[PDB]
Amino acid sequence: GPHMATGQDRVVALVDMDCFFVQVEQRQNPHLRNKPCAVVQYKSWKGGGIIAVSYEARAFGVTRSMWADDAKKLCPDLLLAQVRESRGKANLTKYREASVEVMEIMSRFAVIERASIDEAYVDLTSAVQERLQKLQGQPISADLLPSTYIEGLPQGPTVQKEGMRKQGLFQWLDSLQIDNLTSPDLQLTVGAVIVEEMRAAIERETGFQCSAGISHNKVLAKLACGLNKPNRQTLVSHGSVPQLFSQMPIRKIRSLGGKLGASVIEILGIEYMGELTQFTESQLQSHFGEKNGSWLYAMCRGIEHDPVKPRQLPKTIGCSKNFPGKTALATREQVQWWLLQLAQELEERLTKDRNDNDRVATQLVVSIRVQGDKRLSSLRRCCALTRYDAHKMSHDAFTVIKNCNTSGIQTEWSPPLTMLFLCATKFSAS
DNA sequence: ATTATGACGCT
DNA sequence: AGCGTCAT
Ligand SMILES: Nc1nc2c(ncn2[C@H]2C[C@H](O)[C@@H](COP(=O)(O)OP(=O)(O)OP(=O)(O)O)O2)c(=O)[nH]1
Ligand SMILES: [Mn+2]
Ligand SMILES: [Mn+2]
Ligand SMILES: [Mn+2]
Structure with a gap:
């Protein structure tokens, strides 16, 4: 009854960039805009592996984890952009830098938790309190929520999608008690106003569109965000949960x-x-x-x-490459060369991180996979990371893994290696 | 050959 | 510490 907590204390949003890597490539190359298009890594095996898909291409059945040759069977006019290759491996720097653009804008409105390269949680509780005091009690106009859906509405007592959205929003606003500065439904609504403003700023200042969810916690905000992509936001109220969950797998x-x-x-x-x-x-x-x-x-x-943890920067900086099928590494020279390639990328990224963010990693994690193991990682070992030098990091990684070579020959490596991974961890302020 | 990252829990 | 799970 009166003591039964309802989990309505906070206002939490989840902002996710629509088909992010595709949007980064579409900004750069206008010829790709408003087209079925996808982003691929590599090209020789089956045309490369698709990792991001525009909504136009999704309509043809194109999906992540699909080979480009197969995607072209579903969508012959599909346009492709390739991830950059540096030192023999995919290099994701362009997308990390675009992510920083978006995260820095979001941080103007509220403290954020970077959940991935393209999504962040937002704790809006305090900003909502402030905007409510600025309101002094006027209702919220539907004009302030031009891309918001209210999940579960309209209900009861109509042919177009935008008209449906507006009917639901009108039902929601008509039932608001705007005199109560502690009404959770009112708080969520103001939160959605703020997220409209955040998404408008992101699009104005980067060209990128996003979707978002607004609710009382992270899981509901994430679920809400998925209900109406792309380029829309969804409010999931506490009251909407019984009906929503009654058919939710x-x-x-x-x-x-x-x-x-x-x-x-x-x-x-x-x-x-x-x-x-x-x-x-x-x-x-x-x-x-x-x-x-x-x-x-x-x-x-x-x-x-x-x-929502106050953390806008990643906790780890890692470099990894798979060596599938017949490309698995089978000699010591090979293993050493690729450890060096990974360590050189890691050094570059770490040195930039130290200059930007006033911190230094102190632990190096080395992971490998051996041929025939189904697990992602066959082995993880840590060692000290005391200098940002690629040759030192690659020699240290080789030292921590060399006991895994079961070949009696010094030159051969057996069983061959199907994955290498170097990760810098345990940051300290510098 | 469903790749390259990330976060976090268990013991 | 090293391994597993989950996301995508
Ligand atoms: N390298 C790599 N990047 C991935 C992989 N899966 C996803 N990404 C990247 C590309 C996506 O653009 C980006 C953000 O992922 P999301 O799941 O939010 O999907 P995306 O933004 O592409 O589409 P969305 O509109 O959010 O459904 O992460 C992967 O397996 N490998
Ligand atoms: Mn996304
Ligand atoms: Mn996706
Ligand atoms: Mn995402």
């Missing part, structure tokens, strides 16, 4: 799309998020552990407490 909620979610489905014999409400907290903890059980008990009621 469990795998759609962030962290449940893998083995844990499959086990929730199998053990409990359910399909949808809302079905979780029928279990006690102790029942869920008994199946899925104390932490997961409490998280699921609260999540299926729309409640989640994970904070």
Whole structure:
């Protein structure tokens, strides 16, 4: 009743750039704009692997994780842009630099948590309080929410999509109590006004479009963001959760799309998020552990407490390359040459990071995969990272991995290596 | 040959 | 510390 917490304390947004790498290439090359187009890494094997897809191309069935030759079968007019290659490997610097452009704009409105190269969470609770005091109690005009959907509306008592969006927004605004500065629905609405302003600034100052979700926590904001892409934002209220979750497959909620979610489905014999409400907290903890059980008990009621961490910069700076099939590394000279290539890219990125961000990494993580192992990483070992020098880092990585060569010959490497990975970690202020 | 990154939990 | 999971 009056003591039952409802998880409505915060206003949280999730901003995700639409088909980011594609947009970066479309800004650079206007010939690619408003076209079916995709971004690929490499080219010789099956035309390269697609990693990002414009919405025009998605309409033909093109998807990430598809070979370009196969995508061209679905979409013969598909346009392609290739990721830059430096030192023999894909180099993602252009997209990291574009990401910094967007993150710095978002940080003007509120403190952000960089969740990926193209998405960030935003804690808007305080900004919403401020804008509400600036409002002095006037309602919010629909004109302030020109790209916002209200999930679950319209309802009850109409042929076009924009008209649907506007009907739902009108129903939502008509039911707002704008006199209560602590109304969670009002707070979410003001949050959506601010996110309209943030997205407008991003597009004005970079050319890039994005989608966003606004709700009371990170999981609901992420889920909301996906409901109406591209170039739109969605408000998911606390009240919208029972209907939304009643037909939501469990795998759609962030962290449940893998083995844990499959086990929730199998053990409990359910399909949808809302079905979780029928279990006690102790029942869920008994199946899925104390932490997961409490998280699921609260999540299926729309409640989640994970904070938006104040972190705009990545915690790690890494370099990795797969060597699939017959390109696996089988000699010592090969392994050394590629460790050097990775370490040279790492040195360049670390030196730029030190100048930009006033910090130094102190630990080097070396990971490899050996032929025949299904796991991503066959081995991870750390060593000290005391100087930003590529030859030193590559010799140190070789030292930590050389015991993995089971060949009796000094020159050959067996079993051959199908992955190398160098990662700089444990940053200290400098 | 579903690649190149990231974050975070477990023990 | 080293390994696994999840995202995409
Ligand atoms: N190198 C590499 N980059 C990836 C991979 N998967 C995604 N990316 C990059 C390219 C995407 O443009 C970018 C952001 O990913 P998202 O999942 O948010 O998708 P994207 O922004 O492409 O489309 P969206 O409109 O958000 O559905 O991350 C991958 O497997 N390898
Ligand atoms: Mn995106
Ligand atoms: Mn995507
Ligand atoms: Mn994203």
